[PDB]
């Protein structure tokens, strides 16, 4: 069986849904230089690292993930000290 | 005693014997003997019985989506050749 349609594996658009802007997420940005993202459940640490790297010119220090009760994955992404986490947050909103 | 026949013994009601049964999705999968009480999931067949018309009719075909047969219906009346498309404007 050969497949003609282009692959429907999850790429960046779909792997990373949107940033989280709750009070906790917003507080984390200035203090601990970290960004909170909502991702599809099928993502993993490597997927999220590569996705943020190639979606925004940001280099990851570490990723922590959790599965919410709303059917998605919340990812705390700590940015390296080379580039601060506030101007990138301003850049994307 | 205090865990007597009724209310006392009912206090020790934890540790269910049945769970979700990935095939039926119904909480009837006997955990100890690894076998669904509703469909017998490890076995290949469906575990139907003619002495329960109710049970037959609450899980027969057409109870669910019929994701494919409902599409293949009416092709008997259309009789289109596969790969054919309507002639364009």
């Amino acid at each position: 069986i050969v497949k003609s349609c282009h692959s429907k594996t999850l790429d960046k658009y779909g792997l990373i849904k949107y940033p989280l802007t709750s009070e906790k997420a917003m507080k984390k940005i200035e203090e601990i230089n970290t960004l909170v993202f909502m991702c599809d459940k099928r993502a993993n640490k490597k997927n999220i690292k590569k996705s943020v790297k190639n979606l925004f010119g940001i280099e990851c220090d570490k990723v922590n993930v959790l599965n919410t009760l709303n059917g998605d994955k919340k990812a705390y992404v700590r940015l390296s000290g080379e580039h601060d986490a506030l101007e990138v947050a301003n850049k994307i909103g | 005693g205090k865990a007597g026949k009724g209310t006392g013994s009912f206090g020790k009601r934890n540790g269910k014997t049945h769970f979700l049964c990935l095939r039926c999705g119904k909480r009837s999968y006997h955990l100890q003997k690894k076998k669904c009480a509703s469909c017998g999931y490890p076995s290949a067949k469906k575990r139907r019985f003619n002495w329960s018309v109710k049970a037959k009719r609450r899980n027969t075909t057409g109870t669910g989506r019929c994701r494919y047969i409902k599409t293949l219906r009416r092709k008997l009346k259309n009789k289109f050749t596969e790969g054919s498309t309507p002639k364009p404007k």
Binding site: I1, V2, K3, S4, C5, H6, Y13, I16, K17, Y18, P19, L20, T21, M38, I92, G93 | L72, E82
Partner: protein, 119 residues
């Protein structure tokens, strides 16, 4: 909002590029929706449908150009070959069902059923 006929003439390269940029714009719209911004929330449907349209065109082009690759060759992959009912696939061919031995063939040829009338 793009229709399905004008992009039917594009090559696969710019078809995929259009899909990519359209997905990027949809992602931006979803980011705005997740934020407090809500003015643009109604364009999500249109962008989503545009993505569906360009994907449809690209997949149809790919499938047709794949069929052109297995033109004849008698050994197409299973998805390329026919998808009739299973028993229709396993049915004897009409030629096989109509096949007959030489003995009965010559019997039928020499004494066919005849048309006639009566007084």
């Amino acid at each position: 909002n793009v229709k399905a006929y004008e992009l039917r003439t594009l090559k696969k390269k710019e078809l995929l590029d259009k899909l990519d940029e359209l997905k990027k714009e949809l992602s931006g719209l979803r980011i705005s929706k997740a934020l407090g911004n809500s003015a643009k929330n109604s364009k999500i449907h249109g962008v989503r449908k545009n993505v569906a349209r360009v994907l449809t065109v690209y997949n149809q082009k790919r499938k047709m150009e794949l069929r052109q690759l297995y033109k004849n060759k008698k050994f197409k992959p299973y998805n390329l070959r026919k998808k009739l009912t299973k028993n229709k696939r396993l049915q004897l061919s009409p030629k096989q069902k109509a096949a007959m031995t030489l003995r009965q063939k010559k019997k039928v040829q020499n004494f066919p059923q005849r048309k006639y009338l009566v007084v």
